[PDB]
């Protein structure tokens, strides 16, 4: 209040430097402050959400501004395959001369933009820098609008009631209809009116869209259900994207498959797509009751789902209370669903590449995947971490009297025993099979390897029509039920995309699929072993069942009762961050070494040399860091010196993590005392005495900052290697 | 394209903004 932490006086009393670090790290924990009540919490997070969305749109207006002002965007639009897309320019006063000739792409020395943003803005139909300036101003306006709301809903006449936040009953009716249905339907209002004509040559700006309809006849004779007119003339084969030549004029054709030339999804397919998703989400918005009262009461929707079998507790009685009155359950489901959405998005940005001339720049497709995968694993780990925060600082087992959650805490020993079982099964049967293949290949014999065909994924590709296997089932068999059931609609345009091999849809498969996918399921079941462990033993363990009392991230219980290093529910986050980075590590290493074998062409280089570990470390890490690690020589440098300097940099970050993770506090707590003696005793400087007392970082913080350097070093090392590797083998 | 604006804005955000922000935040420990 009066000290540094202007919010909690329990830290302002501490004259050490703990008040700084805990004053920073508890700044957003609004549930545990001095006098921040229930209404005062929601009225703070409702404003800080506006501040956050203002930061998102300041970020996107930043990308619009640098691409608008320093990129080569419309020069890239002139030649999408040839020209490497520029990011923002450089102003280093540290580039002497020789680095300045290692960046010249035009007059600017800008970075090559490895983020796929020109492809998305080129499928949107921005063919200018001017439209990017009007967009950048158009999001400075929106960011200023959200900041003005964040000032507005913290002025006291406009800070809303808590019952308005407990109008959970109607947030879903407004979000699913408006935020999803109206924004998606309006997004067809951008695809149909901009992305359909500006890909068919017709530059339709803000000046002429209220005069030129996307169909030559429209909407006065078209409430009649003659909807085959809108999907009448598809762009069939002989089209180059952006131009008006070789293209039809239909709006909502569902072709299926790719472009033949740009290897992207059809924008007619997307217009029909978000139009359908728009209608279905608007139908979903009409779900629950409100002040009108035609829908579903949420208390009736959960309590009525109780089985007469009696096995599943006394039903969901209590769950509606412990989502409204709780928050980390709602945040846990939020990060859970967003995390599955991000992993799904990464599992479709490469698979069905939506954007024109992606799968042609081989680095941005490899940056988006690994991007949304590490964000995906972060968001799962957050969903479980607020799982444990829900079970500690938010869980009431009396409104949850023998409820489904109380049933979950009841049988949690079986859940942790079986995650430990399946994790122990996979880790002796990837490492069993990889050390078998590595020993056996090492002794001059690739043949005596255990290779198991992953038959189940090959069979599922046979259910989606990949005819390169010889199963001849539902879609790979042309005489089945489903193969005839959409014979005209979207199948024959799509099996061209399936049975092709260059495209990244339903990849060709050897036993590296088998062994790696067991390693990935190993990574998931281990990481959920940690998280479900420290999220169900978050409340109480038989080492110490007082764990509900000490809050979430208390340090330990001291050396008593055997020793108690990291008993808290913060070890679920703490250890599952290392397993998260390991698992998303193995995912994106596997994906990246798959597509470096497709794009180079030698898939036989993968399938013969990926089932043993020196196949990875030899054929992928040692070979594909060759353009990385040659990033600057004693002979000179090139454009990848930033990524090799970032590479060595991030090894230094990743190893400064180990100074905090391994070597814990009391070493430094009895060494900062030596430094404080050395400064208290020295002359000419004992005048300059500290105010906050020098104290080594407490071990809630120590394992955190070691974790943070572990992630920053890990992720910056791998973002250095993806981009330097694929930028070195190509471009 | 104003090719002179990063010569002003890059140093004044890169170095002198973490001078006055150190003053505002670090004296704002005591304010």
């Amino acid at each position: 209040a009066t000290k540094f932490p202007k919010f909690s006086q329990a830290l302002a009393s501490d004259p050490t430097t703990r008040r700084i670090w805990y004053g920073i790290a508890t700044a957003h924990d609004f549930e545990s402050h001095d006098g921040m009540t229930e209404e005062n919490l929601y009225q703070k997070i409702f404003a800080s959400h506006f501040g956050h969305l203002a930061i998102i749109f300041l970020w996107t207006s930043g990308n619009l501004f640098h691409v608008a002002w320093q990129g080569n965007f419309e020069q890239w639009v002139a030649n999408p395959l040839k020209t490497k897309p520029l990011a923002h320019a450089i102003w280093d006063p540290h580039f002497g001369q020789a680095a300045l000739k290692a960046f010249t792409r035009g007059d600017t020395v800008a970075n090559i933009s490895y983020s796929g943003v020109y492809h998305w803005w080129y499928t949107i139909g921005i063919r200018n820098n001017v439209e990017l300036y009007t967009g950048a101003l158009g999001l400075l306006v929106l960011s200023a609008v959200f900041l003005l709301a964040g000032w507005l809903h913290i002025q006291p006449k406009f800070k809303p009631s808590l019952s308005w936040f407990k109008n959970n009953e109607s947030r879903l009716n407004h979000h699913l209809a408006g935020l999803f249905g109206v924004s998606s339907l309006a997004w067809t209002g951008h695809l149909v009116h901009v992305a359909i004509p500006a890909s068919r040559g017709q530059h339709v700006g803000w000046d002429n869209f209220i005069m030129t309809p996307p169909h030559p006849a429209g909407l006065q004779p078209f409430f009649t259900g003659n909807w085959s007119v809108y999907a009448q003339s598809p762009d069939s084969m002989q089209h180059v994207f952006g131009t008006s030549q070789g293209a039809g004029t239909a709006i909502l054709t569902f072709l299926g498959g790719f472009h033949p030339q740009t290897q992207s999804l059809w924008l007619t397919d997307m217009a029909h797509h978000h139009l359908a998703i728009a209608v279905i989400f608007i139908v979903a918005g009409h779900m629950y009751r409100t002040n009108f009262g035609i829908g579903h009461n949420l208390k009736t929707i959960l309590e009525a789902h109780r089985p007469p079998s009696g096995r599943l507790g006394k039903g969901h009685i209590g769950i509606y209370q412990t989502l409204t009155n709780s928050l980390h359950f709602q945040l846990g489901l939020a990060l859970a669903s967003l995390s599955v959405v991000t992993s799904l998005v990464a599992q479709h940005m490469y698979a069905m590449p939506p954007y024109a001339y992606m799968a042609f720049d081989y680095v941005t497709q490899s940056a988006l995947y690994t991007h949304h995968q590490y964000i995906a694993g972060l968001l799962i780990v957050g969903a479980f971490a607020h799982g444990a925060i829900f079970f500690i600082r938010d869980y009431d087992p009396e409104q949850n009297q023998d409820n489904v959650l109380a049933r979950m805490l009841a049988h949690k020993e079986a859940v942790i025993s079986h995650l430990s079982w399946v994790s122990l099964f996979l880790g002796f049967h990837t490492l069993g099979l990889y050390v078998h293949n590595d020993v056996v290949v090492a002794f001059g014999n690739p043949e005596k390897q255990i290779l198991i065909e992953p038959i189940f994924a090959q069979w599922i590709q046979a259910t989606s029509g990949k005819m390169l296997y010889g199963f001849q089932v539902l879609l790979s068999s042309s005489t089945s039920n489903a193969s005839v059931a959409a014979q005209q609609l979207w199948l024959p345009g799509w099996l061209e995309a399936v049975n092709n091999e260059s495209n990244s849809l339903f990849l060709t498969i050897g036993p590296g699929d088998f062994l790696v996918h067991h390693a990935i399921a190993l990574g998931l079941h281990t990481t959920t072993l940690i998280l479900v462990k420290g999220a169900l033993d978050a409340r109480g363990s038989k080492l110490m069942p007082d764990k509900k009392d000490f809050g979430y991230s208390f340090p330990c219980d001291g050396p008593g009762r055997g020793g108690t290093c990291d008993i808290s529910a913060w070890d679920a986050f703490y250890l599952a961050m290392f397993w998260m980075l390991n698992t998303i590590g193995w995912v994106t290493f596997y994906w990246h070494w798959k597509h470096l074998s497709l794009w180079q062409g030698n898939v036989a280089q993968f399938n013969e040399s990926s089932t043993y570990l020196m196949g990875w470390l030899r054929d992928y890490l040692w070979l594909n860091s060759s353009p990385l690690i040659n990033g600057y020589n004693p002979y000179g440098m090139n454009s990848l010196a930033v990524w090799s300097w970032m590479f060595l940099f991030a090894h230094l970050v990743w190893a400064t993590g180990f100074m905090f993770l391994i070597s814990w506090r009391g070493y430094w707590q009895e060494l900062i005392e030596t430094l404080a003696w050395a400064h208290e005793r020295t002359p000419l400087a004992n005048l300059i005495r500290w105010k906050d007392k020098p104290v080594a970082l407490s071990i809630v913080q120590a394992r955190l900052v070691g974790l943070v350097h572990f992630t920053v070093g890990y992720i910056l090392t791998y973002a250095a290697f993806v981009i330097a590797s694929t930028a070195g083998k190509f471009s | 394209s104003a090719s002179y604006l990063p010569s002003i804005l890059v140093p004044t955000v890169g170095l002198i903004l973490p001078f006055a922000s150190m003053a505002i935040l670090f004296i704002a420990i005591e304010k």
Partner: peptide
Amino acid sequence: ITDNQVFVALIMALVCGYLAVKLAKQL
């Protein structure tokens, strides 16, 4: 690609900066 539009942008994010610091010393 032009000059005065950049100045319009820095004015609008100067206003946005004043709304950010206007949000800052109230929460």
